[PDB]
Amino acid sequence: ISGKTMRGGPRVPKAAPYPYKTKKYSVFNAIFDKTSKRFDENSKVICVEGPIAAGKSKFAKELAEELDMEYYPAVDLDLIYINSYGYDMRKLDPQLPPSCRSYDVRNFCLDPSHDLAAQFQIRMYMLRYSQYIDALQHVLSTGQGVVLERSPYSDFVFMEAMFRQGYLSRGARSVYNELRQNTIGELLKPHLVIYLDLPVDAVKKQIKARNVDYEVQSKVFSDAYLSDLEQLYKQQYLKDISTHAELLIYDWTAGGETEVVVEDIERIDFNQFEADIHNKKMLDWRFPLEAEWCEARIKYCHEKPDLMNYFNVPRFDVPELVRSADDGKVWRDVWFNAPGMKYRPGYNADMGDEGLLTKTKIGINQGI
Amino acid sequence: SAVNDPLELLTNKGTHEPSFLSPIWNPIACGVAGVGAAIFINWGFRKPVFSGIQKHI
Numbered sequence: 001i002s003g004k005t006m007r008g009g010p011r012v013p014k015a016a017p018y019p020y021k022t023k024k025y026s027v028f029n030a031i032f033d034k035t036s037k038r039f040d041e042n043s044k045v046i047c048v049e050g051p052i053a054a055g056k057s058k059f060a061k062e063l064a065e066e067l068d069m070e071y072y073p074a075v076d077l078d079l080i081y082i083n084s085y086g087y088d089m090r091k092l093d094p095q096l097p098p099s100c101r102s103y104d105v106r107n108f109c110l111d112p113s114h115d116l117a118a119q120f121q122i123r124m125y126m127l128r129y130s131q132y133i134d135a136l137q138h139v140l141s142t143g144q145g146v147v148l149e150r151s152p153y154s155d156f157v158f159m160e161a162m163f164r165q166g167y168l169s170r171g172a173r174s175v176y177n178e179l180r181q182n183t184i185g186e187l188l189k190p191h192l193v194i195y196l197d198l199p200v201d202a203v204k205k206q207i208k209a210r211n212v213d214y215e216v217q218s219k220v221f222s223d224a225y226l227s228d229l230e231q232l233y234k235q236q237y238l239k240d241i242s243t244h245a246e247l248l249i250y251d252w253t254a255g256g257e258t259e260v261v262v263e264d265i266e267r268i269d270f271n272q273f274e275a276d277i278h279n280k281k282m283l284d285w286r287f288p289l290e291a292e293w294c295e296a297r298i299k300y301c302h303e304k305p306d307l308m309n310y311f312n313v314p315r316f317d318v319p320e321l322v323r324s325a326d327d328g329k330v331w332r333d334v335w336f337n338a339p340g341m342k343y344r345p346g347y348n349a350d351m352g353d354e355g356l357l358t359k360t361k362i363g364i365n366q367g368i
Numbered sequence: 369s370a371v372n373d374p375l376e377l378l379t380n381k382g383t384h385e386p387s388f389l390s391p392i393w394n395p396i397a398c399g400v401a402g403v404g405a406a407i408f409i410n411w412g413f414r415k416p417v418f419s420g421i422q423k424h425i
């Protein structure tokens with residue numbers, strides 16, 4: 001990793017960027033277009049983790065604009081509840097049954113003890129897992145490194161944090177652990193992890209300084225929930241990720257400086273871990289052949305429906321994650337008769353689409 | 369004929385007229401099968417069933 005200040009300009013790509021959002025990458029595309037020809041020192045996956053009030057979007061934005069990488073924002077549940085046409089599905093809440101209504105993080109902030117919350121965290125995992133592969137498709141196909149505000153490796157910390165406060169049952173822990181044991185072994189671990197360290201009182205101070213209308217007057221962010229998550233980070237997630245990823249603890253109780261952490265990143269030698277073949281650090285990115293590199297690119301640019309179909313675990317013993325059949329029927333009749341999702345995206349003529357009589361272009365990795 | 373000759377049973381005299389559907393049944397049944405297969409493809413992908421009529425043609 002080399003910054004823009006020492007390099008004296010923007011980085012140059014070693015090859016042309018592959019249009020991974022338009023063209024598929026099968027083995028017959030992998031014969032011609034190689035994938036290790038566009039890799040350099042700025043092809044790392046950096047996850048900037050921290051507490052909930054630490055500045056991570058601004059820091060990840062300036063790190064992406066400083067190290068010449070792409071900033072991937074934090075996931076929020078507007079990605080499900082707003083479709084591709086821009087229609088909000090929170091306006092279908094009176095039509096939906098109350099056991100199948102909308103549950104965003106605002107509804108968690110006022111009502112954390114609701115039965116949908118055990119669904120909600122799982123939904124958050126289904127947006128982190130869907131983002132990281134979308135991060136990995138940017139690493140393997142274009143060569144540009146990515147930086148993520150949140151990672152699916154760190155999402156279990158919030159799961160035990162809602163468990164310890166009492167918002168989750170033991171069955172919700174069991175089904176999230178089954179989903180994690182089913183899914184977390186299929187995606188590559190990041191190269192570098194930045195933990196922006198904050199004490200428990202300064203998190204509350206930044207929360208009341210932000211003055212977001214659902215963070216204030218909420219009983220979720222007490223002195224036990226924040227302390228539980230900051231303890232649980234540093235003694236479960238950091239200890240798990242330090243075996244593979246480099247771990248950088250930064251005292252973010254002040255405003256925080258950007259040039260010192262770019263200096264701290266730049267002195268890290270990334271080639272010393274490739275000397276040992278069986279080294280635990282950077283084991284997931286150690287591909288000795290071009291065929292293994294192309295197999296790794298195929299696994300995320302072409303086999304993303306497989307990794308999204310790996311969320312198909314049946315666990316019916318929990319009552320708060322089973323949608324009843326009449327409620328599921330009226331949920332289908334409301335949700336799939338919406339103006340946005342009557343058909344697949346790009347083929348809905350009710351919301352201003354033309355030329356459908358001669359259109360047979362499905363798309364790549366599109367949710368149906 | 370008063371004999372049950374085996375050779376004249378297989379010999380085509382030419383008095384059997386083919387039906388109206390006999391020369392034309394298989395192309396129109398396979399055309400309807402192809403149109404229904406394209407409609408089935410468009411239904412399985414949640415496309416409109418008559419979207420992309422070039423595939424049907």
Ligand SMILES: Nc1nc2c(ncn2[C@H]2C[C@H](O)[C@@H](COP(=O)(O)OP(=O)(O)OP(=O)(O)O)O2)c(=O)[nH]1
Binds near residue numbers: 051074
């Ligand atoms: N239940 C639950 N809540 C979550 C989860 N992830 C985040 N949250 C909630 C807790 C907090 O209210 C808030 C966390 O804030 P963020 O991590 O998005 O940081 P914030 O945007 O405040 O600052 P930043 O963008 O990092 O500068 O969202 C999760 O997985 N589950």
